[PDB]
């Protein structure tokens, strides 16, 4: 029995909307649902891309390593091997 | 939440032409108009689920990581929960 959990994009791009907020970082998933309303840069920004593959952003604004310490504790599985992109 | 705009899937419904289309996937809205010609899989079977929901399709041909990122710059708004099924 493996000891990761693994999602397909199809399932994490359901996941878009306040009541259930997923997002893809650096090909692992995070439940950020009840950090919206305690980030920084704002709640709008980040349902903008809920459902996605954020990381692009997330590196472009340039992140602290306070805020990827952070991170850690949404994380809810790793994006399927047939969905990585090589 | 904030920001977020909200159509009702029969203002979807009117822009079914090469005109305006719009495209309903995962329950987001995406004007597509601009993205006609530009489509890998042609304009055809674009404008042939113009105006309605096409999760369905977009998914059952397993696009790309790359195919949904592209989907970023097309999105206009969310559907009014209201018009979403169970
Ligand atoms: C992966 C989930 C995220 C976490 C845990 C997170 C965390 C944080 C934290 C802790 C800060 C405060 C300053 C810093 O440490 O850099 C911050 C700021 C910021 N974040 Fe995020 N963030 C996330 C995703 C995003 C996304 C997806 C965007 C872009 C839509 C974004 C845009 C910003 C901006 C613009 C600021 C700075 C706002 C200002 O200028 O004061 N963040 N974030
Ligand atoms: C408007 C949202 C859509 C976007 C952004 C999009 C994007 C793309 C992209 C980038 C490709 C190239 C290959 C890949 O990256 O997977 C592709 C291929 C394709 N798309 Fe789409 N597409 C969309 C909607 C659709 C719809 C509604 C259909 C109709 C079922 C469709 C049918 C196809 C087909 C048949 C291919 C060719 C696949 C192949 O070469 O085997 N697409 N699409």
Redesign the interface.
């Known amino acids: 029995d493996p000891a990761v959990t693994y999602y397909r994009?199809?399932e994490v791009?359901?996941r878009?909307?306040?009541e259930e907020t997923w997002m893809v970082i650096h090909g692992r998933v995070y439940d950020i649902t009840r950090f919206?309303s305690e980030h920084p840069g704002?709640?709008?920004l980040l349902?903008?891309?809920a459902?996605?593959?954020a990381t692009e952003s997330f590196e472009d604004l340039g992140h602290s390593p306070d805020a990827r310490e952070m991170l850690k504790q949404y994380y809810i599985g790793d994006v399927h091997p047939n969905?990585?992109?090589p």
Do not use: I, P, S
Request: net charge negative.
């Open positions: 994009l199809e791009a359901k878009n909307t306040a919206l704002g709640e709008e349902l903008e891309q459902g996605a593959d969905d990585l992109k």
